[PDB]
Amino acid sequence: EDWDLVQTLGEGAYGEVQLAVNRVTEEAVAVKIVDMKRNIKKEICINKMLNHENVVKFYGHRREGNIQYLFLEYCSGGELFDRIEPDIGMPEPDAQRFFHQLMAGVVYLHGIGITHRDIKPENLLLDERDNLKISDFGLATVFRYNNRERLLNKMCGTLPYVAPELLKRREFHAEPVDVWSCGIVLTAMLAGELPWDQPSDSCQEYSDWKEKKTYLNPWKKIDSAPLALLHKILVENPSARITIPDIKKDRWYNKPLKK
Ligand SMILES: Nc1ncnc2[nH]cnc12
C-alpha cells in the first residue's frame, strides 16, 4: 500500500483529489488531500458510516502530518458533468438510468439519517460499468439521529442546485433540499442547461418556472413525461414537493426506455 500519485482528478474547495495506483497490485484509488492549516473530521466520520453501490466507497485515511489523506473508490468514468452535452444534454434512456441510481443512492443516505447537501453533476461520478456514485461528503451532515429529525439552518451548496427554502427560510428539512438538487440534476441531464442562477423571487428565469411558462428553454427541450415529474420536484413549498417514495411512483420514472 505505497501508492504513486498520478493525475489530479480535481478540487471542489476542501482539498485536491489524486488518482493513486498501487506500486505492486496496481489497484487504482482516489486520494483526497487536505492541509489542516493552509467540518473535515465530519467528512471522515460520515464516510465511515457509508456502504452503498451508489455512494463512493470509503477505504480509509492516514493523517501523516499537516495533510489529511482520504482513500476513496475510483470512478474511471469521471463526473456525470461530462456526459451532459452543453444545451442538449444526453439521451433520455441514460438520463433516467443515472436518476434511478441517484435516487437509489439518496434513498440510502436519507434512510441512514445522512443528507449530502451538494447534489450536482460534478459530485456524481461514473465507474467502469457506467454506474453513478455519490461523492464528496465535505458538506454532508446527520439530519435524523436516535430517530429524531433535526432541522438544518446552515446555508451551503451550489446556488443553481439549492432549494428555495434554503434562501427564504431560517431552518428547513434536509430531505426536500436533496430532492430539489436531484430535480435540477434531471433538468441539466435532459436539457444540458441550468434553468436559473439561484431559486430566488428576484430572478426572471425562476419567476417564469413558478408561472409554468414551460414554453421557454430549458423546459421546451424536455418531453412531457419527465417534464411532469420535474413540476412535482421543483415545487417551492417543501411540504408540497414530492418525496422519493412517490418519485418511485411517477410515470416517467417507471417508463421503459433503457436496454
Ligand atoms: N472517487 C473519485 N473517482 C474519480 N474522480 C474523482 N474525483 C474526485 N473523487 C473522485
mmCIF file of C-alpha atoms and ligand atoms in Angstrom:
data_model
loop_
_atom_site.group_PDB
_atom_site.id
_atom_site.type_symbol
_atom_site.label_atom_id
_atom_site.label_comp_id
_atom_site.label_asym_id
_atom_site.label_seq_id
_atom_site.Cartn_x
_atom_site.Cartn_y
_atom_site.Cartn_z
ATOM 1 C CA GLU A 1 0.000 0.000 0.000
ATOM 2 C CA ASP A 2 2.668 2.520 -1.193
ATOM 3 C CA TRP A 3 0.640 4.288 -3.913
ATOM 4 C CA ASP A 4 2.082 6.655 -6.585
ATOM 5 C CA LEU A 5 0.024 9.886 -7.040
ATOM 6 C CA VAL A 6 -0.545 10.335 -10.831
ATOM 7 C CA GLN A 7 -3.171 12.707 -12.302
ATOM 8 C CA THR A 8 -5.066 15.416 -10.392
ATOM 9 C CA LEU A 9 -8.796 14.457 -10.526
ATOM 10 C CA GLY A 10 -9.969 17.878 -9.198
ATOM 11 C CA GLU A 11 -10.522 20.079 -6.098
ATOM 12 C CA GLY A 12 -14.085 21.112 -5.051
ATOM 13 C CA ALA A 13 -12.839 23.517 -2.304
ATOM 14 C CA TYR A 14 -11.689 21.429 0.731
ATOM 15 C CA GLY A 15 -8.744 19.594 -0.943
ATOM 16 C CA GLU A 16 -7.114 18.087 -4.080
ATOM 17 C CA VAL A 17 -8.032 14.530 -5.250
ATOM 18 C CA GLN A 18 -5.304 12.469 -6.974
ATOM 19 C CA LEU A 19 -5.577 9.180 -8.830
ATOM 20 C CA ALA A 20 -3.205 6.843 -6.928
ATOM 21 C CA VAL A 21 -2.132 3.485 -8.454
ATOM 22 C CA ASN A 22 -0.682 0.824 -6.124
ATOM 23 C CA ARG A 23 3.011 0.015 -6.897
ATOM 24 C CA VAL A 24 2.649 -3.820 -6.525
ATOM 25 C CA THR A 25 -1.078 -4.893 -7.084
ATOM 26 C CA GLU A 26 -1.862 -1.859 -9.380
ATOM 27 C CA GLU A 27 -5.263 -1.323 -7.618
ATOM 28 C CA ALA A 28 -6.220 2.237 -8.784
ATOM 29 C CA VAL A 29 -7.607 4.548 -5.985
ATOM 30 C CA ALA A 30 -8.502 8.248 -5.415
ATOM 31 C CA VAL A 31 -6.666 10.062 -2.581
ATOM 32 C CA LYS A 32 -8.331 13.272 -1.387
ATOM 33 C CA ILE A 33 -5.681 15.580 0.229
ATOM 34 C CA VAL A 34 -6.431 18.349 2.817
ATOM 35 C CA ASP A 35 -3.941 20.769 4.522
ATOM 36 C CA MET A 36 -5.446 21.418 8.002
ATOM 37 C CA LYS A 37 -3.704 24.875 8.119
ATOM 38 C CA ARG A 38 -3.403 26.268 4.504
ATOM 39 C CA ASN A 39 -16.173 20.034 9.006
ATOM 40 C CA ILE A 40 -13.302 17.790 7.724
ATOM 41 C CA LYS A 41 -13.298 15.407 10.728
ATOM 42 C CA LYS A 42 -17.039 15.094 9.981
ATOM 43 C CA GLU A 43 -16.378 14.059 6.322
ATOM 44 C CA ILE A 44 -14.187 11.142 7.547
ATOM 45 C CA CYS A 45 -16.811 10.210 10.164
ATOM 46 C CA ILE A 46 -19.757 10.285 7.710
ATOM 47 C CA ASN A 47 -17.650 8.283 5.150
ATOM 48 C CA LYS A 48 -17.108 5.657 7.909
ATOM 49 C CA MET A 49 -20.920 5.065 8.121
ATOM 50 C CA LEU A 50 -21.500 4.780 4.324
ATOM 51 C CA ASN A 51 -21.935 1.489 2.365
ATOM 52 C CA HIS A 52 -23.971 1.531 -0.907
ATOM 53 C CA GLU A 53 -23.226 0.756 -4.602
ATOM 54 C CA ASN A 54 -24.257 4.394 -5.477
ATOM 55 C CA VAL A 55 -22.012 6.045 -2.830
ATOM 56 C CA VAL A 56 -18.233 6.337 -3.474
ATOM 57 C CA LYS A 57 -16.677 3.501 -1.333
ATOM 58 C CA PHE A 58 -14.515 4.910 1.526
ATOM 59 C CA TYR A 59 -11.367 2.752 2.034
ATOM 60 C CA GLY A 60 -9.637 4.574 4.939
ATOM 61 C CA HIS A 61 -7.447 7.521 5.994
ATOM 62 C CA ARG A 62 -3.986 8.205 7.482
ATOM 63 C CA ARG A 63 -3.131 11.671 8.929
ATOM 64 C CA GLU A 64 0.710 11.640 8.477
ATOM 65 C CA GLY A 65 1.339 15.336 9.352
ATOM 66 C CA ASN A 66 -0.405 18.658 8.451
ATOM 67 C CA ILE A 67 -2.063 16.883 5.436
ATOM 68 C CA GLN A 68 -5.105 14.553 5.714
ATOM 69 C CA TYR A 69 -5.392 11.704 3.158
ATOM 70 C CA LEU A 70 -8.796 10.142 2.289
ATOM 71 C CA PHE A 71 -8.681 6.837 0.373
ATOM 72 C CA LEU A 72 -11.807 6.688 -1.810
ATOM 73 C CA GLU A 73 -13.179 4.433 -4.610
ATOM 74 C CA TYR A 74 -12.030 5.218 -8.187
ATOM 75 C CA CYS A 75 -14.549 6.241 -10.825
ATOM 76 C CA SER A 76 -12.639 5.660 -14.121
ATOM 77 C CA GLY A 77 -15.800 7.078 -15.789
ATOM 78 C CA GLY A 78 -15.303 10.546 -14.164
ATOM 79 C CA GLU A 79 -18.059 13.108 -13.398
ATOM 80 C CA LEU A 80 -21.589 12.966 -14.898
ATOM 81 C CA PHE A 81 -20.834 16.677 -15.671
ATOM 82 C CA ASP A 82 -19.063 15.472 -18.892
ATOM 83 C CA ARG A 83 -21.871 13.145 -20.191
ATOM 84 C CA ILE A 84 -24.049 16.301 -20.412
ATOM 85 C CA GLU A 85 -23.544 17.987 -23.853
ATOM 86 C CA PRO A 86 -23.987 21.867 -23.203
ATOM 87 C CA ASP A 87 -27.516 22.986 -24.479
ATOM 88 C CA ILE A 88 -28.652 19.403 -25.457
ATOM 89 C CA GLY A 89 -27.983 17.051 -22.519
ATOM 90 C CA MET A 90 -27.898 13.289 -23.096
ATOM 91 C CA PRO A 91 -30.210 10.565 -24.396
ATOM 92 C CA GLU A 92 -33.414 10.218 -22.207
ATOM 93 C CA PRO A 93 -32.804 6.438 -21.611
ATOM 94 C CA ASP A 94 -29.388 7.174 -19.912
ATOM 95 C CA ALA A 95 -30.733 10.287 -18.105
ATOM 96 C CA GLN A 96 -33.305 8.006 -16.413
ATOM 97 C CA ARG A 97 -30.716 5.295 -15.557
ATOM 98 C CA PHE A 98 -28.483 7.769 -13.674
ATOM 99 C CA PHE A 99 -31.614 9.172 -11.894
ATOM 100 C CA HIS A 100 -32.565 5.616 -10.799
ATOM 101 C CA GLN A 101 -29.022 5.360 -9.255
ATOM 102 C CA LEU A 102 -29.061 8.923 -7.840
ATOM 103 C CA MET A 103 -32.492 8.082 -6.336
ATOM 104 C CA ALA A 104 -31.113 4.700 -5.101
ATOM 105 C CA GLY A 105 -28.059 6.449 -3.629
ATOM 106 C CA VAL A 106 -30.037 9.259 -1.922
ATOM 107 C CA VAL A 107 -32.730 6.886 -0.537
ATOM 108 C CA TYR A 108 -29.841 5.034 1.199
ATOM 109 C CA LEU A 109 -28.229 8.138 2.799
ATOM 110 C CA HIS A 110 -31.655 9.626 3.711
ATOM 111 C CA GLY A 111 -32.595 6.249 5.213
ATOM 112 C CA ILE A 112 -29.408 6.350 7.401
ATOM 113 C CA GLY A 113 -30.109 9.918 8.614
ATOM 114 C CA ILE A 114 -27.495 11.460 6.280
ATOM 115 C CA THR A 115 -28.018 14.355 3.769
ATOM 116 C CA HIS A 116 -25.371 15.249 1.119
ATOM 117 C CA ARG A 117 -26.218 18.985 0.690
ATOM 118 C CA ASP A 118 -24.372 19.267 -2.662
ATOM 119 C CA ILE A 119 -26.008 17.009 -5.229
ATOM 120 C CA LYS A 120 -24.637 18.346 -8.574
ATOM 121 C CA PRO A 121 -23.240 16.633 -11.728
ATOM 122 C CA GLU A 122 -19.589 17.340 -10.590
ATOM 123 C CA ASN A 123 -20.377 15.234 -7.448
ATOM 124 C CA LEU A 124 -21.894 12.337 -9.393
ATOM 125 C CA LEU A 125 -19.099 10.208 -10.811
ATOM 126 C CA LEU A 126 -19.395 7.215 -13.166
ATOM 127 C CA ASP A 127 -17.377 3.964 -12.743
ATOM 128 C CA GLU A 128 -16.247 1.254 -15.259
ATOM 129 C CA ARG A 129 -19.742 -0.326 -15.756
ATOM 130 C CA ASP A 130 -21.075 3.325 -16.036
ATOM 131 C CA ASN A 131 -22.641 3.217 -12.529
ATOM 132 C CA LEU A 132 -23.305 6.590 -10.819
ATOM 133 C CA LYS A 133 -21.698 7.176 -7.400
ATOM 134 C CA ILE A 134 -22.485 10.000 -4.943
ATOM 135 C CA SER A 135 -19.143 11.611 -3.905
ATOM 136 C CA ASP A 136 -17.705 14.445 -1.681
ATOM 137 C CA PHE A 137 -19.155 14.282 1.859
ATOM 138 C CA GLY A 138 -17.474 17.580 2.812
ATOM 139 C CA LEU A 139 -20.857 19.357 3.132
ATOM 140 C CA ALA A 140 -22.720 16.206 4.380
ATOM 141 C CA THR A 141 -24.454 16.145 7.829
ATOM 142 C CA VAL A 142 -26.771 13.996 10.010
ATOM 143 C CA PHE A 143 -30.387 15.316 9.960
ATOM 144 C CA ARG A 144 -32.009 12.283 11.677
ATOM 145 C CA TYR A 145 -30.379 10.588 14.724
ATOM 146 C CA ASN A 146 -31.878 8.388 17.516
ATOM 147 C CA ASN A 147 -34.932 8.555 15.165
ATOM 148 C CA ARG A 148 -35.202 12.286 15.985
ATOM 149 C CA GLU A 149 -35.095 14.535 12.871
ATOM 150 C CA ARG A 150 -33.118 17.812 13.345
ATOM 151 C CA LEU A 151 -33.593 20.838 11.041
ATOM 152 C CA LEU A 152 -30.531 22.318 9.281
ATOM 153 C CA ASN A 153 -30.222 26.140 9.255
ATOM 154 C CA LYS A 154 -26.619 26.488 7.991
ATOM 155 C CA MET A 155 -26.714 27.623 4.326
ATOM 156 C CA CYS A 156 -24.407 25.675 1.974
ATOM 157 C CA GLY A 157 -24.374 24.247 -1.563
ATOM 158 C CA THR A 158 -24.118 25.491 -5.172
ATOM 159 C CA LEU A 159 -26.727 28.251 -5.876
ATOM 160 C CA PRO A 160 -28.245 26.748 -9.118
ATOM 161 C CA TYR A 161 -28.844 23.299 -7.366
ATOM 162 C CA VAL A 162 -30.029 24.695 -3.960
ATOM 163 C CA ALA A 163 -33.724 24.653 -2.929
ATOM 164 C CA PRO A 164 -35.574 27.959 -2.369
ATOM 165 C CA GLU A 165 -36.482 27.220 1.291
ATOM 166 C CA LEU A 166 -32.706 27.456 1.933
ATOM 167 C CA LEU A 167 -32.642 31.086 0.626
ATOM 168 C CA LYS A 168 -36.013 32.080 2.110
ATOM 169 C CA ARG A 169 -36.434 30.133 5.476
ATOM 170 C CA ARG A 170 -34.262 30.169 8.698
ATOM 171 C CA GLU A 171 -34.452 26.368 9.217
ATOM 172 C CA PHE A 172 -35.666 23.615 6.819
ATOM 173 C CA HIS A 173 -35.941 19.783 6.428
ATOM 174 C CA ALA A 174 -32.911 18.092 4.800
ATOM 175 C CA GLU A 175 -34.653 15.524 2.537
ATOM 176 C CA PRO A 176 -36.535 18.078 0.343
ATOM 177 C CA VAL A 177 -33.283 20.098 -0.180
ATOM 178 C CA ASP A 178 -31.737 16.978 -1.801
ATOM 179 C CA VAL A 179 -34.920 16.059 -3.816
ATOM 180 C CA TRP A 180 -34.689 19.640 -5.340
ATOM 181 C CA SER A 181 -30.973 19.245 -6.356
ATOM 182 C CA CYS A 182 -31.889 15.793 -7.796
ATOM 183 C CA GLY A 183 -34.632 17.586 -9.866
ATOM 184 C CA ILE A 184 -32.100 20.159 -11.108
ATOM 185 C CA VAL A 185 -29.677 17.299 -11.977
ATOM 186 C CA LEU A 186 -32.569 15.869 -14.027
ATOM 187 C CA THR A 187 -33.021 19.282 -15.765
ATOM 188 C CA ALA A 188 -29.251 19.505 -16.580
ATOM 189 C CA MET A 189 -29.214 15.894 -17.924
ATOM 190 C CA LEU A 190 -32.282 16.364 -20.206
ATOM 191 C CA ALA A 191 -31.692 19.927 -21.499
ATOM 192 C CA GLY A 192 -27.935 20.417 -20.876
ATOM 193 C CA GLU A 193 -28.790 23.820 -19.298
ATOM 194 C CA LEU A 194 -29.184 25.002 -15.664
ATOM 195 C CA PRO A 195 -32.583 26.784 -15.567
ATOM 196 C CA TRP A 196 -31.553 29.717 -13.268
ATOM 197 C CA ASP A 197 -28.710 31.362 -11.314
ATOM 198 C CA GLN A 198 -30.457 30.600 -7.976
ATOM 199 C CA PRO A 199 -34.117 29.924 -6.961
ATOM 200 C CA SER A 200 -34.809 33.493 -5.621
ATOM 201 C CA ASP A 201 -38.020 35.509 -6.245
ATOM 202 C CA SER A 202 -35.714 38.307 -7.619
ATOM 203 C CA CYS A 203 -34.816 36.004 -10.618
ATOM 204 C CA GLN A 204 -36.590 36.148 -14.031
ATOM 205 C CA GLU A 205 -35.889 32.543 -15.077
ATOM 206 C CA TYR A 206 -37.288 31.104 -11.771
ATOM 207 C CA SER A 207 -40.277 33.548 -11.719
ATOM 208 C CA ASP A 208 -41.131 32.048 -15.176
ATOM 209 C CA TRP A 209 -40.916 28.489 -13.721
ATOM 210 C CA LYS A 210 -43.456 29.262 -10.932
ATOM 211 C CA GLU A 211 -45.535 30.889 -13.752
ATOM 212 C CA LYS A 212 -45.455 27.468 -15.593
ATOM 213 C CA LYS A 213 -44.054 29.197 -18.735
ATOM 214 C CA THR A 214 -42.886 25.696 -19.831
ATOM 215 C CA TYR A 215 -42.646 27.008 -23.443
ATOM 216 C CA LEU A 216 -39.216 28.580 -22.684
ATOM 217 C CA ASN A 217 -35.799 26.910 -22.505
ATOM 218 C CA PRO A 218 -34.678 24.853 -20.806
ATOM 219 C CA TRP A 219 -38.171 23.307 -20.383
ATOM 220 C CA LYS A 220 -39.106 23.097 -24.103
ATOM 221 C CA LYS A 221 -36.148 20.683 -24.643
ATOM 222 C CA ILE A 222 -37.848 18.167 -22.257
ATOM 223 C CA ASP A 223 -40.638 15.643 -23.083
ATOM 224 C CA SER A 224 -43.977 15.978 -21.189
ATOM 225 C CA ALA A 225 -43.360 12.682 -19.266
ATOM 226 C CA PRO A 226 -40.135 13.767 -17.472
ATOM 227 C CA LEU A 227 -41.406 17.367 -17.550
ATOM 228 C CA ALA A 228 -44.413 16.217 -15.383
ATOM 229 C CA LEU A 229 -42.005 14.693 -12.772
ATOM 230 C CA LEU A 230 -39.980 17.966 -12.673
ATOM 231 C CA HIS A 231 -43.191 20.041 -12.000
ATOM 232 C CA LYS A 232 -43.643 17.751 -8.956
ATOM 233 C CA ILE A 233 -39.971 18.198 -7.843
ATOM 234 C CA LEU A 234 -39.375 21.992 -8.224
ATOM 235 C CA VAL A 235 -42.436 22.908 -6.139
ATOM 236 C CA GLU A 236 -41.448 25.951 -3.952
ATOM 237 C CA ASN A 237 -43.092 24.583 -0.745
ATOM 238 C CA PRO A 238 -41.019 21.692 0.578
ATOM 239 C CA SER A 239 -44.143 20.082 2.172
ATOM 240 C CA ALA A 240 -45.925 20.188 -1.217
ATOM 241 C CA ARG A 241 -42.784 18.924 -3.087
ATOM 242 C CA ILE A 242 -42.836 15.196 -3.963
ATOM 243 C CA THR A 243 -40.969 12.703 -1.761
ATOM 244 C CA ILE A 244 -38.650 9.910 -3.016
ATOM 245 C CA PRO A 245 -41.181 7.115 -2.197
ATOM 246 C CA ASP A 246 -43.603 8.986 -4.563
ATOM 247 C CA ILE A 247 -40.981 9.784 -7.295
ATOM 248 C CA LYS A 248 -40.638 5.956 -7.402
ATOM 249 C CA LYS A 249 -44.392 6.000 -8.468
ATOM 250 C CA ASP A 250 -44.065 8.792 -11.167
ATOM 251 C CA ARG A 251 -44.994 7.760 -14.752
ATOM 252 C CA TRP A 252 -41.625 8.864 -16.304
ATOM 253 C CA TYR A 253 -39.671 7.134 -13.510
ATOM 254 C CA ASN A 254 -41.310 3.727 -14.398
ATOM 255 C CA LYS A 255 -41.463 4.347 -18.241
ATOM 256 C CA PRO A 256 -39.480 1.610 -20.093
ATOM 257 C CA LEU A 257 -36.638 3.315 -22.101
ATOM 258 C CA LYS A 258 -33.203 1.734 -21.225
ATOM 259 C CA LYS A 259 -31.669 -1.570 -22.568
HETATM 260 N N1 LIG B 1 -13.503 8.934 -6.354
HETATM 261 C C1 LIG B 1 -13.220 9.641 -7.445
HETATM 262 N N2 LIG B 1 -13.060 8.989 -8.627
HETATM 263 C C2 LIG B 1 -12.770 9.709 -9.721
HETATM 264 N N3 LIG B 1 -12.606 11.026 -9.838
HETATM 265 C C3 LIG B 1 -12.766 11.649 -8.650
HETATM 266 N N4 LIG B 1 -12.676 12.989 -8.384
HETATM 267 C C4 LIG B 1 -12.924 13.128 -7.051
HETATM 268 N N5 LIG B 1 -13.160 11.992 -6.430
HETATM 269 C C5 LIG B 1 -13.066 11.041 -7.439
#
